């Protein structure tokens, strides 16, 4: 799958 994962800018 070529899904979007979070850009991890916030958590």
């Amino acid at each position, epitope marked *: 799958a070529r899904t*979007k994962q*979070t850009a*991890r*800018k*916030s*958590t």
Partner: antibody
Amino acid sequence: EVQLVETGGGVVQPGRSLRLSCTASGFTFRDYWMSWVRQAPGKGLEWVADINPDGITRYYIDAVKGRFTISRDNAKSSLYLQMNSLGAEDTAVYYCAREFHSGLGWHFDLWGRGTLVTVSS
Amino acid sequence: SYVLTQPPSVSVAPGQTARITCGGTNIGDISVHWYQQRPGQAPLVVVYDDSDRPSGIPERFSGSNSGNTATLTISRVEAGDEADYYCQVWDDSINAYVFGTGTKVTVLR
């Protein structure tokens, strides 16, 4: 003086291509994330794409996927937007914007005057 | 794609206090920024990181964010505050900057 100057705007026929340039001056350009933000006449703000300082990380909205490509020349202090397969939904003023982060969140702390892009025959 | 709901209009008498709403599910958990846009002008940040104020921005602009609503507050509204105001977040799920639809400040007379 700290400013951004968009250029390369104008009239383009549907299906055709346009390349925008943004020239930065007055600050260290290679230190910042840079974005393109657009605004259709009488409408709201829409972020388009952005690129990281090294030029390897890039994000796009779905509306411009596979049509728009963002790039930068850190030596020229310049940002570029390559726009292919334009339609009327792309007609807008295009803004060059600098991104700001300070351990909390991301916003735009600098804008150019914008360049008008008219997609019409 | 995360949704920000703004009222299209806010009315205020001169010298009074304007309140502009940005609505989102748990928008209090994420940071919100505010832009003023005058006619024919590029947008300008007036509040960032929920409540912080850029240098050069008058103290009349303040911000807050809690629960499901962020709020831009403009106190003693004067000549020059008549403008469009946009709330903004970064959606870290689909990875895009998101703007509100915008709120026009109208002066009551």
